[PDB]
Write a protein that binds this ligand. Sequence first.
Ligand SMILES: *[C@@H]1O[C@H](CO)[C@@H](O[C@@H]2O[C@H](CO)[C@@H](O[C@@H]3O[C@H](CO)[C@@H](O)[C@H](O)[C@@H]3O)[C@H](O)[C@H]2NC(C)=O)[C@H](O)[C@H]1NC(C)=O
Length: 327
Amino acid sequence: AASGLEAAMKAAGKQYFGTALTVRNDQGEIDIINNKNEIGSITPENAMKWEAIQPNRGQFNWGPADQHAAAATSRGYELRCHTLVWHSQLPSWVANGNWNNQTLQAVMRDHINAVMGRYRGKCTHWDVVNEALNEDGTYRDSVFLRVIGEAYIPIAFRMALAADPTTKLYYNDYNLEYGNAKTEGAKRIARLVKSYGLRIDGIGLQAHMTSESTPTQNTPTPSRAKLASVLQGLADLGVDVAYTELDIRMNTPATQQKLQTNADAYARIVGSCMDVKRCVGITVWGISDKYSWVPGTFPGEGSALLWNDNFQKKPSYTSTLNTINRR
Ligand SMILES: *[C@@H]1O[C@H](CO)[C@@H](O[C@@H]2O[C@H](CO)[C@@H](O[C@@H]3O[C@H](CO)[C@@H](O)[C@H](O)[C@@H]3O)[C@H](O)[C@H]2NC(C)=O)[C@H](O)[C@H]1NC(C)=O
């Protein structure tokens, strides 16, 4: 059996195992990533969001994005580019702008053209629209929805196809794994893009899960079979699927019991990908717990990744690798 996650995915007939990355002076994560049998895809954690790429109108900021893209290209790794149209952390000039339908679209077009154009032939996937849905499956309120309406989603995909047809155009979102109204919303989005005669290549399930009930998420990672049916249901529309931001949080501190329970949760969701032909790959949201978004965003929650604060493999790493390698 293969001894690293990427090699295991390849041996099993999948495309990649990836991770989110922030380039920093601490070499702990990158030294693990350097192993070509371990990781084969990178998602820049922050360097390619709208604020990072165009913080002021017409003034692009390529340095960090170039640096993170180079981390993947210099190693011959795939790159998930993240993300174009997203409500969160929009620059003030976009979020608080005085827009009409036509002028906001011109702004979208200019941004999409410049960023997709620069990294064309490097971005394996693009998260074209991110987190466009409320928890009840209705459209999340943002400047894009207010000014352009529902049509902003297909228009974004039309602009993305024009700027770089060689990439895979993804819709990305969290909490789609549970087979509910939000899952249905993602399907509505995919249907809508296809209705315009446009291309949607994939649906990204972020997979920010829990292994036990937490204050922010009461429902722990569902059964392997349930997750497989959700994945296939999305694949039915004629798209690839992928787990894009996988982490599985618990109430801290961890104990051996909680670590094993967490490992079981990883086996279920990783297994669900193994079960579905159109599930192309898995990206975890970082290598080490040391730099995870979780404890800062939701204090009292954490221990969500495959390596601990000391860059040592947790029980979840072994359960993940074994699950990929199974039969
Ligand atoms: C802002 O302007 C855009 C055009 O620049 C408007 O987008 C248009 O929206 C309508 C729906 O309101 C789209 O119609 C749909 O077409 C598909 C298939 O072609 C069909 O399945 C639907 O039943 C519906 O008829 C239309 O295609 C779209 N036009 C373009 C060029 O994309 C948008 O409505 C404007 N927003 C506001 C708030 O006024």
